[PDB]
Write an enzyme that holds these catalytic residues in place. Sequence first.
Site, PDB file in Angstrom:
ATOM      1  N   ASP B  25       2.819  -5.497   5.877  1.00 32.60           N
ATOM      2  CA  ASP B  25       1.663  -4.801   6.312  1.00 32.60           C
ATOM      3  C   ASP B  25       1.956  -4.572   7.679  1.00 32.60           C
ATOM      4  OD1 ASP B  25      -0.689  -3.654   7.074  1.00 32.60           O
ATOM      5  OD2 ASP B  25      -1.791  -5.131   6.077  1.00 32.60           O
ATOM      6  N   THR B  26       2.834  -3.112   8.052  1.00 30.99           N
ATOM      7  CA  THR B  26       2.915  -2.981   9.406  1.00 30.99           C
ATOM      8  C   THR B  26       1.770  -2.588  10.191  1.00 30.99           C
ATOM      9  OG1 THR B  26       3.425  -0.669   8.655  1.00 30.99           O
ATOM     10  CG2 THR B  26       5.285  -2.030   8.698  1.00 30.99           C
ATOM     11  N   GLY B  27       0.525  -2.470   9.508  1.00 28.35           N
ATOM     12  CA  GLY B  27      -0.716  -2.124  10.095  1.00 28.35           C
ATOM     13  C   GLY B  27      -1.463  -3.414  10.703  1.00 28.35           C
TER      14      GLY B  27
END
EC number: 3.4.23.16
Lengths: 99, 99
Positions: B25-27
């Site tokens: 999850d890069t966010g």
Amino acid sequence: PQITLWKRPLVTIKIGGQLKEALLDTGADDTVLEEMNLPGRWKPKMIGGIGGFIKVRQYDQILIEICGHKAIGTVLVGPTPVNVIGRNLLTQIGCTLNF
Amino acid sequence: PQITLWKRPLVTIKIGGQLKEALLDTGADDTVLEEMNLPGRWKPKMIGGIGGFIKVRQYDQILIEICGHKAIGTVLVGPTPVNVIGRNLLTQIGCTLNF
Ligand SMILES: CC(C)CN(C[C@@H](O)[C@H](Cc1ccccc1)NC(=O)O[C@H]1CO[C@H]2OCC[C@H]21)S(=O)(=O)c1ccc(CO)cc1
């Protein structure tokens, strides 16, 4: 380009004739943008994450330019604290995770 | 490996000796896992997501293996809808975004 993850992966997008900052977010199925008064038809949707759900407006076939890469697809508009580009558009610009 | 985004980037992780599935999850700035038992001291903390804020147990300096790549860092445990691997650990396994 290659974006490291030391900091939030924020890039400039162009949508609805406006420039904005948004996260390249592999954890979002769909794209969610801060409140904005887009023309056209929409349908209501509820999306959920940490903390619960927010109500958003689903617009279809919206053009978005992400770092100069054009895409077109679903854009959800609502009281999100952050603009997030989700997988529905990240796939369209050729974005991968790599390690 | 190189991971395309037509489906959720779900991977198997090992934490506290137990296998689980988690989302890259890069966010997410931080790593948040669903309720589980973990050894060692923890301190209460708050974290905010798209829908508001939740109470979590913060575990520091926890060993965690992500798709065969080892990391040691902070893991937040609480009522998240999905096990997410956030940037604090993605950087350790050398993960970048590329397009
Ligand atoms: C949770 C995940 C499965 C899904 N989400 C994406 C995540 O990346 C989310 C993005 C984010 C939200 C709010 C503020 C900053 C970043 N990050 C997040 O919650 O991170 C937590 C942990 O680390 C901290 O750092 C930043 C926040 C803290 S979602 O936004 O809820 C979502 C849900 C449904 C759709 C429609 O498909 C699209 C997006």
